[PDB]
Amino acid sequence: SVLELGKMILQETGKNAITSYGSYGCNCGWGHRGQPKDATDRCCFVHKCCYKKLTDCNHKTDRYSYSWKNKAIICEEKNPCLKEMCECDKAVAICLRENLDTYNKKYKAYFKLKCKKPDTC
C-alpha cells in the first residue's frame, strides 16, 4: 500500500513522497495521466503500468512485507499479488533515485498544467 511505497521512496531518495512526487509532472502525481515530461515522470508512468497488472490485490491499501537491508529493498512478501505489488514499488523507488539528477521542482506543481496524451503501457 501507500505506506510501503512512501517509505521506500524516502529510503531511496530522501524525499517526502506526497510533497515532492504526489503532483509531479504528468504521471507521478496522484490521479495524473499523460505523456511524461522527464525521466522522473517516466518512472511514474512505468509504475502505473506495473500496478495495472495487479488484479487480485489493491495497490493503495493492501500492506505487504519488505525489508530495507544493506541499502537495498528486499520484497519478502509471499502472497503473490502482494509480492508483485512490492516489486512495482521497489522499481519506482530505484528509478526515482537514479533520475534524481534531473528532478525539477517546476513540474513539481503540475496538477493544472498541460499534458499530451499518454502512451500505452
Select which of 38, 47, 56, 119 is catalytic: 47
Cβ contacts of residue 59 below 8 Å, gap of 6+?
A: 1, 5, 51, 85, 88
| Calpha distance 119→94 (Å, rounded) | 22
| Calpha distance 87→73 (Å, rounded) | 9
Listed resolution, Å? 2.0
| Calpha distance 98→61 (Å, rounded) | 27
Clarify whether 32 is annotated catalytic: no
Select which of 32, 41, 59, 89 is catalytic: 89
| Ordered structural domains, the chain, with CATH | 1-121 (1.20.90.10)
Give the method used: X-ray
- 30 three-class SS: coil
| Calpha distance 19→38 (Å, rounded) | 18
Residue with cell 537495498: 72
| Calpha distance 25→2 (Å, rounded) | 19
Clarify whether 119 is annotated catalytic: no
Question: Residue 40 CA to chain centroid, in angstroms?
Answer: 10
